[PDB]
């Protein structure tokens, strides 16, 4: 009962929110001996219609809440209004490799029982498939290395984050969007693959990719993909292609090592924001051709299902098309350009405004924002975790940011029961 609780507070402007904070602090101060903290937290979350400008105060006791509310009331912070209207769940974004960091899973294994249970289900599957302990990998003092260890470890964190958000925090996704290997976690969360089959796909794909380690290079360029393609055909380049289209202004190329380096040198000279990306394999390019038949054979028994959640494919040429996640789909996922911008754009055109990247560290939040900006939309692009971010209260901070942004969620998961208290009701203005 004396554990820290989350108290929701909302209004129509930052000044009105502060006025609300001051009246609530005055009320809590006067009735602290009559009100249980749990009943008040329940009333604020489930007995109030949440208004556009939201905040939350974490407190272990009522006097701690009065200090926190008065701190809000005495501040000058500009509280941004929610971009979602509580009608659609968040869009989970599952990014690719590069987000991994040393002991990335340690705090969540200790603070989130559903993260631990998910990692436990994956442990024997990844051990039989790839020959290593995913728990040792995500808790080691050194960052996971080697494509065959990185992909299963990152996928495990991604799916354990989604299961926690749904089972513990009542956050059902409105849609999912994956970027390259992120599509394995996207398929599990959408119901297109079972957890086990998705782990088989990520384990087998990354084991086969070790055979082509050292093959080619990749590069990021702050130029649109249509323009980049014109440059490759005009320059007589046939060994380098557009591998990723992440935003309307951002492109990743992939192909031979020397031509990719040559192109980056050239773009940097013309004052364009170019950079070689360290990858063991140049995916989404002809560098992956030798292993595609073996991948199709390894995934022959993968059993796809009809997605239960809108799944915006970055593999398909129409992102609104619902994938048939068989071995053929995963071969295309490895070889085809990652059409991430078009998938994000389709979800935004369909009305999704809240995006949350369920990954060890954010790789695509800036890309999501750029797509929003090109559509003249107000969107929220959240990071589920950041590198070395302390998580003593697990994923409760992500839940708070999802609530502040306006994503639809089940408030009965975090506030399962209590009595409605006669706390103040600000006017509708």
Tokens of 419: 């009595």
Would you put residue 216 in left (φ > 0), alpha (ψ -120 to 50) or beta?
left
Using an 8 Å Cβ cutoff, are 335 and 168 in contact?
A: no
Distance, in Å, from the CA atom of 47 to the CA atom of 40, rounded to the nearest integer, reads 9
Class of domain 217-277: alpha beta
Tokens of 94: 């599952």
- Could you give the strand order of the β-sheet that contains 240-247, starting from the edge strand earlier in sequence? 240-247, 250-255, 217-221, 275-277
DSSP 88: S
CB neighbour list of residue 120: distance below 8 Å, 6 or more residues apart: none
Sign of the Cα torsion 394, 397, 401, 407 reads positive
Distance, in Å, from the CA atom of 395 to the CA atom of 401, rounded to the nearest integer, reads 10
CB neighbour list of residue 159: distance below 8 Å, 6 or more residues apart: 118, 122, 185, 188, 189, 195, 198
Give the technique used to solve this structure. Answer: X-ray
Is 257 labeled as catalytic in the residue annotation?
no
Q: ∠ CA(179), CA(180), CA(181), 5° rounding?
A: 105
The active-site residue out of 180, 184, 206, 359 is 180
Q: ∠ CA(262), CA(266), CA(270), 5° rounding?
A: 170
DSSP 289: G
For residue 415, which phi and psi values (nearest 5 degrees)?
A: -130, 65
Collapsing DSSP to helix, strand or coil, 196 comes out as helix
Report the relative pairing of strands 91-94 and 175-178 from DSSP bridges: parallel
Q: ∠ CA(17), CA(18), CA(19), 5° rounding?
A: 90
- Of 142, 131, 130, 139, which is closest to residue 160 (Cα–Cα)? 139
- Of 163, 143, 154, 152, which is closest to residue 96 (Cα–Cα)? 154
Distances (CA, A) of 361 to 107, 210, 390: 14, 24, 13
Using an 8 Å Cβ cutoff, are 173 and 312 in contact?
A: no
> What are the beta bridge partners of residue 85?
none
Collapsing DSSP to helix, strand or coil, 76 comes out as coil
């Amino acid at each position: 009962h004396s554990s820290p609780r989350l108290f929701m507070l909302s209004s129509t402007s930052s000044d009105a929110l502060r006025q609300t904070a001051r009246q609530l602090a005055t009320w809590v101060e006067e009735h602290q001996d009559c009100v249980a903290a749990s009943d008040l937290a329940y009333t604020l979350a489930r007995g109030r219609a949440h208004r556009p400008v939201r905040t939350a105060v974490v407190a272990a006791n009522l006097p701690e809440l009065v200090e926190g509310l008065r701190e809000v009331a005495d501040g000058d912070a500009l509280y941004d209004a929610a971009v979602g209207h509580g009608d659609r769940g968040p869009v989970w974004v599952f990014s690719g490799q590069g987000s991994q960091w040393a002991a990335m899973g340690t705090q969540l294994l200790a603070s989130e029982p559903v993260f631990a249970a998910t990692i436990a289900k994956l442990e024997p599957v990844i051990a039989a498939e790839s020959g290593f302990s995913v728990t040792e990998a995500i808790t080691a003092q050194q960052t996971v290395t080697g494509i065959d260890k990185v992909q299963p470890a990152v996928f495990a964190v991604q799916v354990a984050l989604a299961a926690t958000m749904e089972q513990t925090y009542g956050v059902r996704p409105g849609a999912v969007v994956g970027h390259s290997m992120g599509e394995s976690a996207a398929a599990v969360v959408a119901g297109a693959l079972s957890l086990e089959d998705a782990a088989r796909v990520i384990c087998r794909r990354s084991k086969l990719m070790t055979r082509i380690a050292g093959a080619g290079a990749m590069g990021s360029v702050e130029l649109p993909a249509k323009q980049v393609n014109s440059e490759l055909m005009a320059r007589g380049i046939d060994d380098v292609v557009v591998s990723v289209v992440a935003s309307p202004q951002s492109t990743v190329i992939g192909g031979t090592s020397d031509t990719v380096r040559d192109l980056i040198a050239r773009w940097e000279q013309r004052d364009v924001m170019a950079r070689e990306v360290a990858v063991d394999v140049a995916s989404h390019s002809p560098q992956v051709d030798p292993i595609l038949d073996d991948l199709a054979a390894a995934l022959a028994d993968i059993a796809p299902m009809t997605p239960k959640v809108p799944y915006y494919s970055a593999t398909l040429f129409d992102p609104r098309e619902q994938p048939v996640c068989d071995g053929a789909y995963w071969v295309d996922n490895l070889r085809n350009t990652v059409q991430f911008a078009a998938a994000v754009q389709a979800a935004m055109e369909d009305g999704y405004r809240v995006f949350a990247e369920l990954s060890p560290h954010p790789l695509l939040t800036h890309a999501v924002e750029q797509t929003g900006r090109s559509l003249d939309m107000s969107v929220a692009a959240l990071a589920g975790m950041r590198r070395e971010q302390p998580l003593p209260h697990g994923l409760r901070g992500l839940l708070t940011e999802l609530h502040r942004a306006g994503a639809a969620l089940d408030y009965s998961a975090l506030y399962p029961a209590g009595r409605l208290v006669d706390a103040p009701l600000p006017a509708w203005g």
